[PDB]
Design an enzyme around this catalytic site. Structure first.
Site, mmCIF file in Angstrom:
data_model
loop_
_atom_site.group_PDB
_atom_site.id
_atom_site.type_symbol
_atom_site.label_atom_id
_atom_site.label_comp_id
_atom_site.label_asym_id
_atom_site.label_seq_id
_atom_site.Cartn_x
_atom_site.Cartn_y
_atom_site.Cartn_z
ATOM 1 N N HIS A 1 -0.468 -11.949 -0.251
ATOM 2 C CA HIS A 1 -1.160 -10.812 -0.856
ATOM 3 C C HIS A 1 -2.289 -11.256 -1.809
ATOM 4 O O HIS A 1 -2.981 -10.402 -2.344
ATOM 5 C CB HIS A 1 -0.201 -9.785 -1.498
ATOM 6 N N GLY B 1 -0.047 -11.564 -12.547
ATOM 7 C CA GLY B 1 -0.466 -12.952 -12.487
ATOM 8 C C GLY B 1 0.685 -13.924 -12.256
ATOM 9 O O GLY B 1 0.436 -15.111 -12.028
ATOM 10 N N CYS C 1 2.856 -13.815 -9.705
ATOM 11 C CA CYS C 1 3.082 -14.014 -8.271
ATOM 12 C C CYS C 1 2.777 -15.456 -7.880
ATOM 13 O O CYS C 1 1.876 -16.061 -8.443
ATOM 14 C CB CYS C 1 2.280 -13.019 -7.436
HETATM 15 C C1 LIG Z 1 -3.370 -4.969 -7.194
HETATM 16 C C2 LIG Z 1 -3.088 -6.180 -6.343
HETATM 17 C C3 LIG Z 1 -4.113 -6.808 -5.643
HETATM 18 C C4 LIG Z 1 -3.829 -7.901 -4.849
HETATM 19 N N1 LIG Z 1 -2.602 -8.407 -4.701
HETATM 20 C C5 LIG Z 1 -1.610 -7.809 -5.369
HETATM 21 C C6 LIG Z 1 -1.791 -6.703 -6.205
HETATM 22 N N2 LIG Z 1 -0.709 -6.110 -6.917
HETATM 23 S S1 LIG Z 1 0.812 -6.672 -7.106
HETATM 24 O O1 LIG Z 1 0.780 -8.101 -7.059
HETATM 25 O O2 LIG Z 1 1.311 -6.018 -8.277
HETATM 26 C C7 LIG Z 1 1.739 -6.090 -5.726
HETATM 27 C C8 LIG Z 1 1.920 -4.728 -5.547
HETATM 28 C C9 LIG Z 1 2.712 -4.284 -4.501
HETATM 29 C C10 LIG Z 1 3.310 -5.188 -3.634
HETATM 30 C C11 LIG Z 1 3.086 -6.537 -3.819
HETATM 31 CL CL1 LIG Z 1 3.760 -7.672 -2.685
HETATM 32 C C12 LIG Z 1 2.311 -7.011 -4.861
#
Ligand SMILES: Cc1ccncc1NS(=O)(=O)c1cccc(Cl)c1
Ligand SMILES: Cc1ccncc1NS(=O)(=O)c1cccc(Cl)c1
EC number: 3.4.19.12
Lengths: 304, 304
Positions: free
Chosen positions: A41, A143, A145
Site C-alpha cells: 500500500h 508512518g 506501516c
Molecule cells: C492514506 C494512505 C495512503 C497510502 N497508503 C496508506 C494509507 N493509509 S493507511 O496506511 O492508514 C491504511 C488504511 C487502510 C488500509 C490500509 Cl492496509 C492502510
C-alpha cells in the site's frame, strides 16, 4: 526473580530498518540481503486506499519511483515485484547488517516482539501476542506501516509479522513476510470485522506457573478438575479450549513446580468463576495471556 | 493508536555489553570508550557477600585477574579502580560500537529501559520505573548483575541504572553509572528494607490522558476537584502528593485533550474511591503508573 513482559533485544532488526517512499507515501521497509520488503500500500494515495487495484497501480511505478533510504544513504532499486500484499524492492547492495534470518508464519496465541518504526527509524520495542482472531493490540501511528514483528533464537531472527493497518476498532492487522495477511483482512480502507477474540488458555496457565515460581501463590487451591470440566468453564468465559497438546507443552512447568496441569486448571477455573477479589498476580489485576509456555521457561531460566 | 509499555530500541546498548569474570564470579559489564563498568561485587565470593570489605578484597586483585570478553574477543585490562559500588576496568581498546552517551542519575517516578543480560549476552528488553522508594520491579536472575537501565534521545544513550542486587522481598536495587546506589541500599547480603512504596500520581494521570486519546473514556466524569482535596485522597491511597510542577508537566496532555488537569484528578479520585467495577483502562485492570507524561507524549506522537 521477577516477571516482566520482555521483548527480544531489537538490535539485529534495527540494522534492517529503512524508509521507503513512493509518491507522497512514506513507510518502513525491511532490508535483508539485497531485498527491501515493505507493505504494497506504499504505492497508493489516500483516494486509492478505498478500493485499490494493486496490479494496475504498480504498473504506473518504475524502479526509480521507489525511494529507499537507509539512515542517510540512498539505495539504488534495480527490481520491483509484488508478492501477495508486500513489495520486494531488489536493491544493488546487500545490507551489511543482515542478521541470520528466517521468515516464519506464526500461529495464533504465539508471541513476538514488534519494533515500531517511523520514517525508517526505530522508536520502541514491545512484546505482543498474535490474538486467536489474528489481530495484534499494538501501538501504531501513521508512518508505522512496514514495522516488523520477530522472534530471536540465539543469532537467528525469525520475522513473523509486518504491520499493514489499523482496523476501525483500534486493533492492528498485518502480514507474514511473504505478504499473506494473518486473518481475513485485506489491504483496503473498508469496514472489516475481526472475529470474536478468545483468551489464550495455555498462556494464562503458563503465566500462572510463572507466578508460582516467583512467589505469588494465593490463587493455588485444594481442587483439581478434568479437561472436559475445565473446558466447560473455558467456553463460558471465552477461553480457548485446552487440549492434550497444551497440557504437554505445560509439562516442563508442571515438572519444575510440582503442580499438576489439571490442578493449575482448577486454580484458573476458580479465578474465572470468582475473579481476583481485589488481589493481583505478578502485578496484574487480570489474567495475562501474552506469555507462551516457552516465554515463561526462557524468562525463568535466563535464555540469551 | 493503541498504547503499549514500550522500551527503547536496545541496539546501541547491545553493542556495549561484555562479560566480566573475576575468580569464580561472572557478571555483565558495560564497555564505553576504553572503560568497562561493572558492579564491584564481581570481586566477591559467596562468603564475602555477607560482610565484604571491598577495599581489602580489591587489593588482592590485579589487572590480569579481571577477564573481560566482548562476544568472543578478549579485552586487555590495563587499569582498575573502584568508584563507589562500580569497578572501572580500563581496557586498551576503545569500543567501536560506543554510542553517544551520558551518565545520568534519574529521579524516582522516572522511567527507563532495562536490557537484561547473562554472560555479556542480551536476553530481553523491558520498560521499568524507578519506584518512589528507589527500587525497580524488574526480571533479574543470577548472572544478570551489570545489566543496565537507559533512555535514548535521538542518538544519545543516557545510562541511568546498573543492576546490583535483589532484596529478600524480590524487588531490585542498583546504582547510577558512578556507582552510587539509588536508595539506602548497600552491596551486602544483609536484610535491607525498601521503604513504603507509593504510586506515581503524575504518571497515572498521564496514563489516564493516554487512555482518553486512545478511546477509553468511561472513567471521565462530571466532577472536578482542587489540589488540596485531591491530595487528601492521594494520601489515603498511598499516592504521591500532586504538586503544581506535576500539573505543569501535564499541560501538553491537558491541552491536546481539552480535559483540565484538576478534572482528570477528579476522575482519578473516583477511581481510587470506587475501583474499576470490573472494567479495564488501556487493557489494564489497575491504575498504571509506569508511563511518565513524556512517555505518553512520545508514544502518542511517534518520536523516534
Ligand atoms: C492514506 C494512505 C495512503 C497510502 N497508503 C496508506 C494509507 N493509509 S493507511 O496506511 O492508514 C491504511 C488504511 C487502510 C488500509 C490500509 Cl492496509 C492502510
Ligand atoms: C554469591 C555472590 C558472589 C559474588 N557476587 C555476588 C553474589 N551474589 S548476588 O549477586 O546475588 C548478591 C547478593 C547480595 C548482595 C548483592 Cl549486591 C549481590
Amino acid at each position: 526473580s521477577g516477571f516482566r513482559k520482555m521483548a527480544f533485544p531489537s538490535g539485529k532488526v534495527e540494522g534492517c530498518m529503512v524508509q521507503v517512499t513512493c509518491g507522497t507515501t512514506t513507510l518502513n521497509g525491511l532490508w535483508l540481503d539485497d531485498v527491501v520488503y515493505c507493505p504494497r500500500h506504499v504505492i497508493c494515495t489516500s483516494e486509492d486506499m478505498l478500493n485499490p487495484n494493486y496490479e494496475d497501480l504498480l504498473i504506473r511505478k518504475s524502479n526509480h519511483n521507489f525511494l529507499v533510504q537507509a539512515g542517510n544513504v540512498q539505495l539504488r532499486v534495480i527490481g520491483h515485484s509484488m508478492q501477495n500484499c508486500v513489495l520486494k524492492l531488489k536493491v544493488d547492495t546487500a545490507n551489511p547488517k543482515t542478521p541470520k534470518y528466517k521468515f516464519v508464519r506464526i500461529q495464533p496465541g504465539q508471541t513476538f516482539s514488534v519494533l515500531a518504526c517511523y520514517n525508517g527509524s526505530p522508536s520502541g520495542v514491545y512484546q505482543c501476542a498474535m490474538r486467536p482472531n489474528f489481530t495484534i493490540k499494538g501501538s501504531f501511528l501513521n508512518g508505522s506501516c512496514g514495522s516488523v514483528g520477530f522472534n530471536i533464537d540465539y543469532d537467528c531472527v525469525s520475522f513473523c509479522y509486518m504491520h499493514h493497518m489499523e482496523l476501525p476498532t483500534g486493533v492492528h492487522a498485518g502480514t507474514d513476510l511473504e505478504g499473506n495477511f494473518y486473518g481475513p483482512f485485506v489491504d483496503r480502507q473498508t469496514a472489516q470485522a475481526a472475529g470474536t477474540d478468545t483468551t489464550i488458555t495455555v498462556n494464562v496457565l503458563a503465566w500462572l506457573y510463572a507466578a508460582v515460581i516467583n512467589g505469588d501463590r494465593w490463587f493455588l487451591n485444594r481442587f483439581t478438575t478434568t479437561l472436559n470440566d475445565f473446558n466447560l468453564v473455558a467456553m463460558k468465559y471465552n477461553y480457548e479450549p485446552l487440549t492434550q497438546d497444551h497440557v504437554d507443552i505445560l509439562g516442563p512447568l508442571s515438572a519444575q513446580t510440582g503442580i499438576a496441569v489439571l490442578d493449575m486448571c482448577a486454580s484458573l477455573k476458580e479465578l474465572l468463576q470468582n475473579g481476583m477479589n481485589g488481589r493481583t498476580i505478578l502485578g496484574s489485576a487480570l489474567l495475562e495471556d501474552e506469555f507462551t509456555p516457552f516465554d515463561v521457561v526462557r524468562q525463568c531460566s535466563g535464555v540469551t
